[PDB]
Amino acid sequence: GEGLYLSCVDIMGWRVTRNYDVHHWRGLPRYFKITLRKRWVKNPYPMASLISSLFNNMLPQVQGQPMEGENTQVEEVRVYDGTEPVPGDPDMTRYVD
Amino acid sequence: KACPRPAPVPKLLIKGGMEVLDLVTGPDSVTEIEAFLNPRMGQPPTPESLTEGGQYYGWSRGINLATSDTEDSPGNNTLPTWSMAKLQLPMLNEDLTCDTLQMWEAVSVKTEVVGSGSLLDVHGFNKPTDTVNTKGISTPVEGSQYHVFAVGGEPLDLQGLVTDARTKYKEEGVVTIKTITKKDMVNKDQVLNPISKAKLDKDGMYPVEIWHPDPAKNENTRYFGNYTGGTTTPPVLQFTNTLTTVLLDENGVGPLCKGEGLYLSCVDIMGWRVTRNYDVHHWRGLPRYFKITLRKRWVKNPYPMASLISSLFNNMLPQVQGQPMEGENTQVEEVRVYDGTEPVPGDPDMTRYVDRFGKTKTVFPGN
């Protein structure tokens, strides 16, 4: 954002009324002195995400079936980048019952 | 040591659900997505109890007829609807530098409808073979069938045509030509209403009885299927894990998911199952598998940065409402532009224009 988020709590305890046991309680305030600088990072963002945003504008909203979620009807996915010599049993990893 | 080196097969990085995608891939790195759509025609999933919904799940409820020519109102479960979904994919990279970006481009896809075996159940209470002594086989699914599907980089563009523009479709819970174009149907819809065009924005909603893959002059979906009419007509199907198909286009392209989503759409009527109580001819469908193979393709960005960048920053500005320097009553009487420096002309009230290409000492007004 360009935001600095301070957050806190400072309960001291119960203030008790000479009346009864209205233990209604007290807290104090807090000071902050942030020392901050300017640091170069790599843009986390893909600018034409907005071009994509545009496509998501011109492109209607669907209801449509579950291809994400808990009952996703996505059965499986695989990704391949390289070339590995034919594996024996491609799928044989950590055996646990 | 040099134990002979096995054949080179493409190396799987990781498999698993959609999240596997999350992982940076690289740029040649392909993704295989198996998934499927369940056949939603009529009775919805929700009445989970096989008593309350009788579990007609994946079955046209009953077949709601018509009064007579005058009145034909179907039922919202006497109505098989276009089944579909959208796969949401990761965003890939940019290069505002060379103004070029990469997209999710589908290539091939194997698909298969499953459950053709199910239509070998021949007990149960359908009309028996021999009605008479009430014996035989409880008659298999038969009747018209239809399977069609598509795969696209945007939803399916469709077109409505119907049998009788008078059918009393409900305004409620289904998308009809009306629901889309407010007004009612006309004989035109009934044949080729160039107006009656929608998008597959919903699901289990536009019935197939109406909406059809419209061969819009334009498309980023590949689709196909077929009709097979009839009443007794035998159901026929293809069990195979062998074949792939090419979403690739004529220029070697396939679809490209604009909006990092992939769109699957399809329908699979097998035909009517028939009760004994009566000829409550209600129909069945089967689910469909999908194995989409899509790669990363580098494409020329379409619309110019500025436009977006600065189209936005101009939409940020205070909206002004004010006098017309536009439209049909511009309070602007005139505009000229100069850059050069010709030597004095003659007629100072001369004009100048440029047309579909070039610039002209406008005709001496004297035509």
Add this chain to the structure above:
Amino acid sequence: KACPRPAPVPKLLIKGGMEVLDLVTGPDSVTEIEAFLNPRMGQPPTPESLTEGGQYYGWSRGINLATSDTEDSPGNNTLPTWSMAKLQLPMLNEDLTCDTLQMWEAVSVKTEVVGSGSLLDVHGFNKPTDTVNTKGISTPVEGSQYHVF
């Protein structure tokens, strides 16, 4: 370092409707024209009221049978007929000084008959499956079919 170069594809020049043709298309230009013809067999368009024309538009009206080997009356609305049309492209030649003119040549064509789904309406009023108790399905289109173009 450089720029990735997307695959080469035929560059669109303009798209829209017939007006587009007007563009000085050059010579190796290409034109894609999508159009469609409505099936004018039987009932003509015109009576738009689905009560007066019943809206049989896109249907042979009734079946004007004949009287006998001697007598056979057609009934012009009991008669599916050849549907056609003409696209009027633009004129291409202009320099007559040459013994070389230029003209429009058709190359290929995708085509598709649409709406086979329509025939999935099994309710409505057609002879039922079960005539007897008047039940079943208002029996779909069936019969000889013919498609040509």
Add this chain to the structure above:
Amino acid sequence: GMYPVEIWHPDPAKNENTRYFGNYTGGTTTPPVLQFTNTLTTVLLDENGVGPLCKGEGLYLSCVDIMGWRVTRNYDVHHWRGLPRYFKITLRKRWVKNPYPMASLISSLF
């Protein structure tokens, strides 16, 4: 919408600048079948890579799509259904020789 199919046919002339096709599928109960596809293109190109030539800048599409009889729950009013057809005509510019140089009467009525 005039010449009825029941009468007129694509006469295979000696000569033709049109490509045509289709088929009959006779029958009474005969089920209908159709082809939904986006994918396939057809070539009007001829045996010499010529395809048609819009002599007279006209392009002439023509077709007929009978599907069968819809039979009224009544009597046996078999009135039959038809469907529409899309066309994506792909066409280019071809070059030719000026025909007019065939002088006055040398071609006139020839």
Add this chain to the structure above:
Amino acid sequence: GMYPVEIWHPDPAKNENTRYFGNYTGGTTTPPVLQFTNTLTTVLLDENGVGPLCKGEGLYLSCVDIMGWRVTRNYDVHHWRGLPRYFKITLRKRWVKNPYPMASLISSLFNNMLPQVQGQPMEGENTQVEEVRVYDGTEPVPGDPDMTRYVDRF
């Protein structure tokens, strides 16, 4: 001869090392059809030129052949027939990378230097494992690193 066909189907698992093919031809009176012939062969060869590799050292043949029903001239007791299928497989010897980690074998005996544990869920639908990240290389610092790689989370 247990899984009734009536129920079970060749599931196109995302993954497969089998080649199946078949068809359903429905109907009540539907006429049978076949192909008496020893002429052509079929390739189980995979997309990458592989074909099945008998994992285990087995070759698995599976099939079904309903021809339709034989109807008793008695009543209307159909009870259908099927025929046998022959197979002629052609197999070669192929080289692959080793799949069997002896460490598993030997460390199958490691979970015996310790017993079996019940204990809370760290795999399931209740994995009290809220999170895992794996890091390997080094990149300069990014802004928001947990970037919503999906368009809709915007």
